[PDB]
Amino acid sequence: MSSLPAVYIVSSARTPVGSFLGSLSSLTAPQLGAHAIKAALAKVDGLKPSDVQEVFFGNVISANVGQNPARQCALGAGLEESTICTTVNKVCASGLKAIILGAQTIMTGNADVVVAGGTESMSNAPHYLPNLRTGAKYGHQSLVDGIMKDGLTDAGKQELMGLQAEECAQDHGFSREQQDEYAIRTYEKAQAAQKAGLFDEEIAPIQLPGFKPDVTVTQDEEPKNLNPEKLRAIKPAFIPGSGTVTAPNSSPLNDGAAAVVLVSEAKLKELNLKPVAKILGWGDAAQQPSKFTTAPALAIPKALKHAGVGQDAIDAFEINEAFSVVALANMKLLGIPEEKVNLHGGAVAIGHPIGASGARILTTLLGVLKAKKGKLGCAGICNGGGGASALVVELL
Template identity: 45%
Template structure:
């Protein structure tokens, strides 16, 4: 018989804009911040967590096993690419957070559905009675994804950098079609006009602004402390929604194809 599954709670960091206020925070740090804020918010001891599933699509250069870093708390301490802390140090960090280093952690890459798939896997493990307490999470920092350079002998004409965000995150491996261009094709197939898309986008921005204005978002946000040299500042609000210009929206050129 399946066991009943209960979602105890959930917290998230603010959503940052590309290469903006949160861009310097390692993806593992963002994930760790949200995970431990959630445990604190619902009053659960980290030591009772037996397993975790963490969605992450473009983890390049985040260090070995980024999902495990986030769950054990290492992301807040050794997320720097210059850090050479040993596994023992990360174990100490995990103990500091109260999570046993034997906790099973699995990274999930199912593109945009990675976080959702993590929730599904966590629920299935609970339903089957495999575990009693499981973390389901998702994390990403596209601003920190590096450019790639192929190894080997330098060819005639030089080397070319490949954008890791496009290569591993946004371009289909089979058709070489950008995800945005694929969306344009779907819109064309189902007769969704440019005007309808603009209207929906504007409605989404207005809903987000209203939610923030009415305090709806506050209960799910954990502020992130960002260090900038010797200075420190706090990010506690989504960055993108205030930047919209409703008058300019209908005049923007298509981002991926010429189709309107």
């Protein structure tokens, strides 16, 4: 990875993360993505939106978004019609795999300026009617919830990912109480970062014009919802009685987008750009689909080896909190202390727009490294179907 051309991150930006049918539910996935792309580019002194050559953008539940969500994000952000645009689906890892592909396109010399990231509007995922073309002569028919079908259900076993999270808790010995106390801790971290202004730089607030007064959405919607007594008292979500996974200690359904701007070494010099960070390496891994929860335990070492960096040298990790048990299990398998993980809180408290989260956690990681005066960061995100993606950055 050192024998390959350098890839610099010159900026990043994210929408606030809205709740399901909540503050951003009126916006489509390309509207969210355009907002993030435009806000990331506005931060780069000396780089124009017309300089962007290629876009990779993650998006999972693309039904009814229209042709090529990434293209719609790029044009909506004001990029040139000459821009090459590709939508990426690696379920929950989409937004990070998009960034990997953008880096590679710089490395093979086919671009010098790339925007990559991801977007998801789970609020605007439709329902499906699958048999209208051939007809169904007689009998009740099903309207398929696109979130469940294309976002949250493992294709092999037809099992919701929350059921496989329960499998993870049983496999690795994590109780209801260990998961709940993790969830409270990560909500408290997200609230603390919010209150301290530590998301202000990375978030681009959204202005919703009134149809009626305008509305400005500035903060992530979920963190303020923590109620520790109710969190500890709620019923399980997937297994009655003996269940350990709950709605409060799991990720929610959410709307949001995030974007990074990548440039080659040559373009960084030509335009005299100030780099925020360097991409040191990455790794994808996969295992049995129902064990997707611990695929980051393969991807993270793979990315660290690609980067030539030891695990102990990392100053901060972003382990995406698909569920509280996912963070607990990868911390246990890798031997990573929680005091190095999701220092501004994670998806259980912040939200999980699935096509965007892989880029969202990288944006947040750069903020964590700056706030905590760190240098080396690693983001790792599991995905439905058994996979995970991971990436190592150096703050400059």
